[PDB]
Design a protein around this ligand. Structure first.
Ligand SMILES: O=C(O)Cc1csc2ccccc12
Length: 118
């Protein structure tokens, strides 16, 4: 069945290339859709710098580090946290980036993660 964590290599996208700038319209929807796109191989990652979040659509889905002691098989352990109007749904570690749908944009790198599914 579904293991608790899955190894994934996520394409890193530049913010100005992203065509679909979020996963939906509520905290529960964006987390659900993020998880579905991760399962389908159609999720990208944008690294957060000044100017990035105002160019994307709320609610946001972040991947954040879930454990800063080890990174098994060269993949950092992460979990999902959503944000709407400055309030976060989950508490976790440092942000690795914001997740968005991937619809064919050309990435600039890949980020290896070990994702906690739920
Ligand atoms: O391990 C799998 O084949 C399933 C899977 C890959 S990414 C993700 C995200 C949420 C729920 C399930 C999954």
């Amino acid at each position: 069945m579904e293991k608790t964590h899955v190894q994934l290599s996520l394409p890193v996208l530049q913010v100005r290339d992203v065509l679909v700038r979020g996963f939906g319209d509520s905290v529960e929807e964006v987390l659900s859709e993020a998880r579905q796109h991760l399962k389908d191989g159609t999720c990208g990652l944008v690294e957060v710098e000044k100017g990035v979040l105002p160019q994307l659509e709320q609610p946001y889905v972040f991947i954040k580090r879930s454990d800063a002691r080890t990174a098994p098989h060269g993949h950092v352990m992460v979990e999902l946290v959503a944000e709407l109007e400055g309030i976060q749904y989950g508490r976790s570690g440092e942000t690795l980036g914001v997740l968005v749908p991937h619809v064919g944009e050309i990435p600039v790198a890949y980020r290896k993660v070990l994702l906690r599914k739920n």
